[PDB]
Curated annotation (Swiss-Prot), chain A:
It comes from Saccharomyces cerevisiae (strain ATCC 204508 / S288c). This is Small ribosomal subunit protein uS19m. It comes from the Eukaryota. InterPro entries: Ribosomal_uS19, Ribosomal_uS19_CS, Ribosomal_uS19_SF. Transmembrane segments: none annotated.
Swiss-Prot record, chain B:
The keyword Acetylation does not apply. PROSITE patterns: RIBOSOMAL_S14. Its main location: mitochondrion. Pfam families: Ribosomal_S14. Signal peptide: none annotated. The gene is MRP2. Belongs to the universal ribosomal protein uS14 family. It comes from Saccharomyces cerevisiae (strain ATCC 204508 / S288c). GO terms for molecular function: structural constituent of ribosome. Component of the mitochondrial small ribosomal subunit (mt-SSU). Mature yeast 74S mitochondrial ribosomes consist of a small (37S) and a large (54S) subunit. The 37S small subunit contains a 15S ribosomal RNA (15S mt-rRNA) and 34 different proteins. The 54S large subunit contains a 21S rRNA (21S mt-rRNA) and 46 different proteins. This is Small ribosomal subunit protein uS14m. It is found in: Mitochondrion.
UniProtKB/Swiss-Prot annotation, chain C:
One of its GO terms (biological process) is mitochondrial translation. It is found in: Mitochondrion. The chain holds residues 20 to 134 of 177 of the full protein. The keyword Repressor does not apply. Component of the mitochondrial ribosome (mitoribosome), a dedicated translation machinery responsible for the synthesis of mitochondrial genome-encoded proteins, including at least some of the essential transmembrane subunits of the mitochondrial respiratory chain. The mitoribosomes are attached to the mitochondrial inner membrane and translation products are cotranslationally integrated into the membrane. Overexpression of bL31m suppresses mutations in the COX2 leader peptide-encoding and initiation codon regions. GO terms for cellular component: mitochondrial inner membrane; mitochondrial large ribosomal subunit; mitochondrion. This is Large ribosomal subunit protein bL31m. Component of the mitochondrial large ribosomal subunit (mt-LSU). Mature yeast 74S mitochondrial ribosomes consist of a small (37S) and a large (54S) subunit. The 37S small subunit contains a 15S ribosomal RNA (15S mt-rRNA) and 34 different proteins. The 54S large subunit contains a 21S rRNA (21S mt-rRNA) and 46 different proteins. GO terms for molecular function: structural constituent of ribosome. Its main location: mitochondrion. It comes from Saccharomyces cerevisiae (strain ATCC 204508 / S288c) (Baker's yeast). It comes from the Eukaryota. Keywords: Mitochondrion, Ribonucleoprotein, Ribosomal protein, Transit peptide.
Curated annotation (Swiss-Prot), chain E:
Component of the mitochondrial ribosome (mitoribosome), a dedicated translation machinery responsible for the synthesis of mitochondrial genome-encoded proteins, including at least some of the essential transmembrane subunits of the mitochondrial respiratory chain. The mitoribosomes are attached to the mitochondrial inner membrane and translation products are cotranslationally integrated into the membrane. This is Small ribosomal subunit protein uS7m. The chain holds residues 141 to 247 of 247 of the full protein. It comes from the Eukaryota. It is found in: Mitochondrion. Component of the mitochondrial small ribosomal subunit (mt-SSU). Mature yeast 74S mitochondrial ribosomes consist of a small (37S) and a large (54S) subunit. The 37S small subunit contains a 15S ribosomal RNA (15S mt-rRNA) and 34 different proteins. The 54S large subunit contains a 21S rRNA (21S mt-rRNA) and 46 different proteins. Belongs to the universal ribosomal protein uS7 family. The gene is RSM7.
Length: 80, 115, 93, 96, 107
RNA sequence: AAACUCCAUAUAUAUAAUUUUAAUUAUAUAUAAUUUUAUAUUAUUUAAUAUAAAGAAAGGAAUUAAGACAAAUCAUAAUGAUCCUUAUAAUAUGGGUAAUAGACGUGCUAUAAUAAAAUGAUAAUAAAAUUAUAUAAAAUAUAUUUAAUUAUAUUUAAUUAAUAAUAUAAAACAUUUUAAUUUUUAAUAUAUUUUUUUAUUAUAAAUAUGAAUUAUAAUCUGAAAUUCGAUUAUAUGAAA
C-alpha cells in the first residue's frame, strides 16, 4: 500500500526473536516497507539468486527492503 | 503432494486439457470459493473508522492468503487450444483458433468482415 | 601530473626572533547531552554549543544508567509493543 | 448557489433515509466500494466449461450392449505397442 | 491592396499574374543518355500562375509584419504599382528560353 | 479474369399508434447502369474525341489461380521420427524477460506568428461502438476564495439499452495574448486613427519556444508498484 492512507506495507517476519537474540532475518519479501520497529536488525534480503546481508539504519525507515538488494549485475562491455 | 498437483481436488475441464489450463482453472475455482471472504478482509483492512489493530490483522491475513486466492492471478486462456495471447472474451478462443472456428462456421453469428 | 602549490622564496626567521604560534582561540561552552556544561578553548567562532550524541547519553559510557521522522509524520493517524506483537510470527524464516 | 447549504444537506440526508442509500456528508473513505462491488466468482469459475460432461468411459456404463471404440485411444495404444516392440518404450519409473 | 490603391483588387491580381507568369519554361531532359539538352515547353494557365504565386509569396516573406496576410497584400500592391525581383526572374527565364530556339522538336 | 457478393448510393413498397423517435430515421423486400441516345470531327460498317439531353448515378471492401521460394510457423493446435522419465515431467517463493558501449529500423514530441496559448452555458456542428467478469450521471468535499476548468475522493441516479451512461465532439469561427523585435512598454503633452495617433524622454543566438532529466508531496489499481505500472501538484527546464 503506497498511498499514505492504508499504509504502510506490512509483512509477517521473525522480528521479535531477532530483537531478543541477533539472528538475521532472511527476507524473500522485497516489497515489505521498513519500519521504525526494525532499525538495527540484521536482514538478509533476497536478490533473486543470493540473500544479501544488510543492517537497517534510521535513514532506511521509509523504503522497501528490495530497494537495497540490487538484482542485476553492473553492466560492462567487452571491448573486442 | 503426489496424488494431486494443487492442495484441493478439483475436476478437469472438458475438452482441451493442458498444464497451464489446469493451473488456471484450479486458481479460478479457488477464487470463486474464497471471493466473499477476501472482499470482507479487504473491507476490514481499508477502514478509517474501525480499530487499527483489527485492520492490521486483516491486512496480514490478506498477505498470507495463497497464490490461488488472488483474482489478479487469473488469466483468460484459449479454451479450444491453451494459448494466452490475443484471447477474445466473446468466444473464449485465441486469435488464430477463433479465425479457424469462425471460417468453419462454429461460431454462432461470426462471418467475414466485408463492409 | 602531480598537482602542487609552487613555493615562493622562504622568509628568513632570524635566530632568537622566532615567535611561538599562538592561534586565536575563543572560550567555548559545550553543553553535553545532559545539562553538564564544560568550557573548552576552540578556534572556531562559537561561544555556545549544545551536543546531542555524547558519552553522557551513550550506553557504552554508562551501562548502569530525518527519514524516521518523516515516516512518523505521514503514518500518524494509524499510530503504527502491541503492533510488533501483532506482526511478528516467527515460524517462517 | 443562493440557496443555503445546511438546508440542502438536510434534504440530502432525508432522501438517503427514504431510500436505502447512505449519507456521507464529510466525504470520508467508508469502504463502501469494496463490499458493494458485485462478486464475479461463479462466472469466472464457469470459464473452461461444465466438468460433468459425457465421456467415452460412460460413450460403457450407460449402454453396455454396444461395443464402442475410442479411436484416438486405440491409436495411442498401438503406438505404445510399436514402441515396446522396437526398443523405444518408456523406461520403468523410479519409486524410492 | 484595394485600400492602398482604390481599384478592383482581384482584376489587379490577375493582371499581375499575367505579367509575371513566364509563358514557357526550359524543361530539362536526359536526352537518350547524352547531353541534357533543355527544351522550351509551353505552360498551362495554372502552371503559369503557380510559378508567379511562389515568387510573390517569397517576395512577401521579405516584408516586415508578423501577419503573413499583411505582407502578402503589401507585395501585391508593389506588383500592381510595378516593382519586384519576380519580374527580373521572369525576364531571365524568357532569355534562357530564347536561347535554345530550335531545340523544340515539332517546331 | 469478369460477373453474381458485401458496404455505400437513388427510387419504390411494407412496418414503427412519431413517448425506445432519429420519420432529416431503421430494416426487410424489390428495381436501378459493366449507363443510354443523337449531332459533328479525325481515321477506317465501326472507334476515339468534342458537343448536346436523359439520368441520383460517382466509389470502396472481400475474392490474390497454377506453380515456385525445401519462404514463415513443431511457441495456436495436432502428428511422424527421435531424445528426457526423481526429470528435458509437476508445484511454490523471489529474480529475469524492462540489463546498456556503439549500431539499425518503425513511431511520438518538438525546434513559435500563412502559429502557439486563455476564454466562448439559451452549451456551433459528427459518426461509429461499448456497457451482468458492467457504463457510472448528477450533486458534495479537497487541490484552489469566489466559480469554472482539470484531477482525485465521497455516493450510485439511470440502463443491461434505438429508451440511461461512456460523451456539452474537436479543429472551425470570434475576442485576448504572444519573446526574438526601441516592430514594445510608461511619464508627459498631443488630436477629426482615441481598444489609437504624433512629439520628446526613459525602456541595453533557446523565450512568456520545447518538455527531456531529476527532487519532494499526494492520488489510482491491486493482496503486493523495490527491481517494474498510471495520474495530479509544487519545483527542475537537456537537446533541438
Ligand atoms: Mg490478469
Ligand atoms: Mg421524431
Ligand atoms: Mg473476381
Ligand atoms: Mg498461387
Ligand atoms: Mg519450408
Ligand atoms: Mg526452410
Ligand atoms: Mg514433432
Ligand atoms: Mg522450436
Ligand atoms: Mg503442443
Ligand atoms: Mg521441471
Ligand atoms: Mg521486449
Ligand atoms: Mg508554436
Ligand atoms: Mg462546443
Ligand atoms: Mg459528474
Ligand atoms: Mg442514450
Ligand atoms: Mg513551455
Ligand atoms: Mg542547446
Amino acid at each position: 500500500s503506497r498511498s499514505v492512507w492504508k499504509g504502510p506495507n506490512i509483512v509477517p517476519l521473525p522480528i521479535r526473536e531477532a530483537m531478543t537474540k541477533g539472528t538475521p532475518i532472511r527476507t524473500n519479501a522485497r516489497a515489505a516497507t521498513i519500519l521504525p520497529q526494525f532499525v538495527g536488525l540484521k536482514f538478509q534480503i533476497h536478490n533473486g539468486k543470493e540473500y544479501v546481508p544488510i543492517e537497517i539504519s534510521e535513514d532506511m525507515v521509509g523504503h522497501k527492503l528490495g530497494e537495497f538488494a540490487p538484482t542485476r549485475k553492473r553492466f560492462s562491455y567487452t571491448q573486442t | 503432494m503426489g496424488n494431486f498437483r494443487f492442495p484441493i481436488k478439483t475436476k478437469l475441464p472438458p475438452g482441451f486439457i493442458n498444464a497451464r489450463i489446469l493451473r488456471d482453472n484450479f486458481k479460478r475455482q479457488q477464487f470463486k470459493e474464497n471471493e466473499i471472504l477476501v472482499k470482507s478482509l479487504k473491507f476490514i483492512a481499508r477502514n478509517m473508522n474501525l480499530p487499527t489493530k483489527l485492520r492490521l490483522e486483516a491486512q496480514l491475513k490478506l498477505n498470507a492468503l495463497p497464490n490461488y486466492m488472488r483474482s489478479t492471478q487469473i488469466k483468460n486462456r484459449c479454451v479450444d487450444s491453451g494459448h494466452a495471447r490475443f484471447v477474445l472474451s466473446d468466444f473464449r478462443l485465441c486469435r488464430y483458433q477463433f479465425r479457424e472456428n469462425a471460417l468453419k462456421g462454429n461460431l454462432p453469428g461470426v462471418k467475414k468482415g466485408i463492409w | 601530473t602531480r598537482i602542487t602549490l609552487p613555493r615562493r622564496p622562504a622568509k628568513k626567521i632570524q635566530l632568537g626572533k622566532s615567535r611561538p604560534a599562538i592561534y586565536h582561540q575563543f572560550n567555548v561552552k559545550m553543553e553535553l547531552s545532559d545539562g553538564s556544561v564544560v568550557i573548552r578553548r576552540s578556534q572556531y567562532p562559537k561561544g555556545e554549543i549544545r551536543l546531542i550524541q555524547d558519552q553522557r547519553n551513550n550506553p557504552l559510557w554508562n551501562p548502569s544508567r530525518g527519514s524516521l521522522d518523516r515516516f512518523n509524520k505521514r503514518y500518524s493517524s494509524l499510530f503504527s509493543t502491541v503492533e510488533l506483537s501483532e506482526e511478528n510470527k516467527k515460524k517462517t524464516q | 448557489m443562493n440557496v443555503p447549504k445546511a438546508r440542502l444537506l438536510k434534504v440530502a440526508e432525508l432522501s438517503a433515509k427514504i431510500f436505502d442509500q447512505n449519507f456521507n456528508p464529510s466525504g470520508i473513505r467508508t469502504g463502501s466500494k469494496i463490499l458493494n462491488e458485485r462478486l464475479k466468482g461463479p462466472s469466472v469459475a464457469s470459464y473452461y466449461g461444465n466438468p460433468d460432461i459425457l465421456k467415452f468411459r460412460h460413450l460403457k456404463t450407460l449402454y453396455p450392449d454396444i461395443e464402442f471404440v475410442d479411436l484416438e485411444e486405440q491409436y495411442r495404444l498401438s503406438m505404445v505397442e510399436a514402441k515396446k516392440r522396437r526398443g523405444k518404450g518408456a523406461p520403468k519409473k523410479m519409486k524410492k | 491592396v484595394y485600400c492602398q490603391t482604390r481599384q478592383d483588387p482581384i482584376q489587379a491580381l490577375e493582371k499581375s499574374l499575367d505579367e509575371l507568369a513566364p509563358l514557357m519554361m526550359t524543361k530539362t531532359f536526359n536526352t537518350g543518355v547524352a547531353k541534357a539538352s533543355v527544351i522550351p515547353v509551353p505552360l498551362n494557365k495554372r502552371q503559369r500562375n503557380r510559378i508567379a504565386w511562389n515568387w510573390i509569396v517569397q517576395s512577401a516573406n521579405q516584408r516586415v509584419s508578423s501577419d503573413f496576410a499583411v505582407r502578402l497584400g503589401e507585395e501585391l500592391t508593389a506588383i500592381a504599382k510595378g516593382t519586384s525581383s519576380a519580374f527580373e526572374k521572369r525576364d531571365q527565364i524568357h532569355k534562357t528560353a530564347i536561347a535554345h530556339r530550335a531545340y523544340i522538336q515539332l517546331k
